[PDB]
Design an enzyme around this catalytic site. Sequence first.
Site, PDB file in Angstrom:
ATOM      1  N   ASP A   1      87.701 -21.755 -53.409  1.00 11.11           N
ATOM      2  CA  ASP A   1      86.303 -21.646 -52.998  1.00 11.11           C
ATOM      3  C   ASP A   1      86.109 -21.912 -51.512  1.00 11.11           C
ATOM      4  O   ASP A   1      85.272 -22.722 -51.114  1.00 11.11           O
ATOM      5  CB  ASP A   1      85.424 -22.602 -53.816  1.00 11.11           C
TER       6      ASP A   1
ATOM      7  N   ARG B   1      79.727 -23.669 -47.234  1.00  9.56           N
ATOM      8  CA  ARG B   1      79.107 -24.827 -47.881  1.00  9.56           C
ATOM      9  C   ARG B   1      80.130 -25.931 -48.141  1.00  9.56           C
ATOM     10  O   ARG B   1      79.769 -27.094 -48.338  1.00  9.56           O
ATOM     11  CB  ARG B   1      78.465 -24.409 -49.211  1.00  9.56           C
ATOM     12  N   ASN B   2      81.408 -25.564 -48.140  1.00  5.08           N
ATOM     13  CA  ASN B   2      82.470 -26.506 -48.469  1.00  5.08           C
ATOM     14  C   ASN B   2      83.231 -26.983 -47.235  1.00  5.08           C
ATOM     15  O   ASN B   2      84.245 -27.667 -47.349  1.00  5.08           O
ATOM     16  CB  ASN B   2      83.436 -25.866 -49.477  1.00  5.08           C
TER      17      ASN B   2
ATOM     18  N   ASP C   1      85.377 -30.068 -49.416  1.00  2.00           N
ATOM     19  CA  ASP C   1      85.175 -30.127 -50.865  1.00  2.00           C
ATOM     20  C   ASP C   1      86.267 -29.367 -51.611  1.00  2.00           C
ATOM     21  O   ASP C   1      86.652 -28.270 -51.213  1.00  2.00           O
ATOM     22  CB  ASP C   1      83.816 -29.532 -51.241  1.00  2.00           C
TER      23      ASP C   1
HETATM   24  C1  LIG Z   1      76.377 -36.531 -42.646  1.00  7.10           C
HETATM   25  C2  LIG Z   1      76.273 -35.416 -43.629  1.00  7.10           C
HETATM   26  N1  LIG Z   1      75.121 -34.741 -43.665  1.00  7.10           N
HETATM   27  N2  LIG Z   1      75.286 -33.810 -44.614  1.00  7.10           N
HETATM   28  C3  LIG Z   1      74.171 -32.917 -44.869  1.00  7.10           C
HETATM   29  C4  LIG Z   1      76.534 -33.836 -45.232  1.00  7.10           C
HETATM   30  C5  LIG Z   1      77.233 -34.913 -44.589  1.00  7.10           C
HETATM   31  C6  LIG Z   1      78.631 -35.362 -44.887  1.00  7.10           C
HETATM   32  C7  LIG Z   1      79.485 -35.982 -43.951  1.00  7.10           C
HETATM   33  N3  LIG Z   1      80.776 -36.388 -44.227  1.00  7.10           N
HETATM   34  C8  LIG Z   1      81.295 -36.185 -45.488  1.00  7.10           C
HETATM   35  N4  LIG Z   1      82.615 -36.599 -45.753  1.00  7.10           N
HETATM   36  C9  LIG Z   1      80.525 -35.569 -46.505  1.00  7.10           C
HETATM   37  C10 LIG Z   1      79.209 -35.182 -46.153  1.00  7.10           C
HETATM   38  O1  LIG Z   1      81.111 -35.387 -47.752  1.00  7.10           O
HETATM   39  C11 LIG Z   1      80.389 -34.746 -48.852  1.00  7.10           C
HETATM   40  C12 LIG Z   1      81.165 -35.106 -50.130  1.00  7.10           C
HETATM   41  C13 LIG Z   1      80.262 -33.210 -48.676  1.00  7.10           C
HETATM   42  C14 LIG Z   1      81.452 -32.423 -48.489  1.00  7.10           C
HETATM   43  C15 LIG Z   1      81.375 -31.020 -48.320  1.00  7.10           C
HETATM   44  F1  LIG Z   1      82.499 -30.320 -48.145  1.00  7.10           F
HETATM   45  C16 LIG Z   1      80.136 -30.346 -48.328  1.00  7.10           C
HETATM   46  C17 LIG Z   1      78.940 -31.078 -48.509  1.00  7.10           C
HETATM   47  C18 LIG Z   1      78.988 -32.497 -48.679  1.00  7.10           C
HETATM   48  C19 LIG Z   1      77.675 -33.189 -48.862  1.00  7.10           C
HETATM   49  O2  LIG Z   1      77.494 -33.607 -50.011  1.00  7.10           O
HETATM   50  N5  LIG Z   1      76.732 -33.337 -47.774  1.00  7.10           N
HETATM   51  C20 LIG Z   1      75.479 -34.041 -48.106  1.00  7.10           C
HETATM   52  C21 LIG Z   1      76.903 -32.840 -46.348  1.00  7.10           C
END
Ligand SMILES: Cc1nn(C)c2c1-c1cnc(N)c(c1)O[C@H](C)c1cc(F)ccc1C(=O)N(C)C2
Length: 294
Positions: free
Chosen positions: A149, A153-154, A170
């Site tokens: 995937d 978005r990932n 992700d």
């Molecule tokens: C600061 C911040 N703002 N946003 C909007 C996000 C983050 C952020 C920062 N660092 C890390 N490690 C994560 C999120 O990880 C999560 C698991 C994650 C991983 C992937 F790939 C996509 C979305 C995602 C997610 O859930 N977000 C909410 C995206």
Amino acid sequence: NPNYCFAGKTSSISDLKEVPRKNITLIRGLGHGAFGEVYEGQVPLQVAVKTLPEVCSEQDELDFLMEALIISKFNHQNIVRCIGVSLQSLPRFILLELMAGGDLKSFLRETRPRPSQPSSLAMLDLLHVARDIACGCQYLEENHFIHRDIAARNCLLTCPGPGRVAKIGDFGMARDIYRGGCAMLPVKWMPPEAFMEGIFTSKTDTWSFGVLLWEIFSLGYMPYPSKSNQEVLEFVTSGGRMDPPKNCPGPVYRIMTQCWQHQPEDRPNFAIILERIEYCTQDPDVINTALPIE
Ligand SMILES: Cc1nn(C)c2c1-c1cnc(N)c(c1)O[C@H](C)c1cc(F)ccc1C(=O)N(C)C2
């Protein structure tokens, strides 16, 4: 406790770095959406905290454990780091590298050049993002891991600013397969042999990377504008391909069309993709091309 094998090495929950719960402090929410919430945290070390709902099934539990194992066993600069886990108190935590730039899709949409921010992004910024993710993909390829995937978005960004680094963030689809429905399959990112025969190889991710490339240079548009999942399925199966994004340089669009070859054998591996991205970044006619201002 289930085993996980990567690069021919076997690991177990006992190999995960358990961080004492008392050492972990939640700061703010970053969003929930999909199953589970994500918080900014401290362990000082700043982290993203992925949580497991205490109200979950045993399968949700196993899924959570498996993604913990998958991410902890990777070691590459373009894959998000796992600082550790907290699985011995509830709700369970996975602790990740804090990527202050957020996910790539939201970034592209929010950072589009505008009359207010006329120089928010340039072709080089996009090429750098593409190279970063392609490097992560090459690492997966050479270690025989199929992501399944690869999509904006990932992916995540270390920071909003120019020195940002993009990483794959992700691995939920690979986790599910390793151990859902039609409507949830990322059909718009999948090659014909994938959604037809359920055959996945390294060339699966090549095709998906082409779609990511389109996402990147479209500045965050949904692929196959105006098309439903089934419409895309029939379109792609019949040889249909996306047009170039607005203002997309021909050399960049050419990488997309090569990633989308019908026969997986005709698609480039990631070493070749990286080489072509490099060549584009060297080409003044490419990087001097102006992105559209909304
Ligand atoms: C600061 C911040 N703002 N946003 C909007 C996000 C983050 C952020 C920062 N660092 C890390 N490690 C994560 C999120 O990880 C999560 C698991 C994650 C991983 C992937 F790939 C996509 C979305 C995602 C997610 O859930 N977000 C909410 C995206």
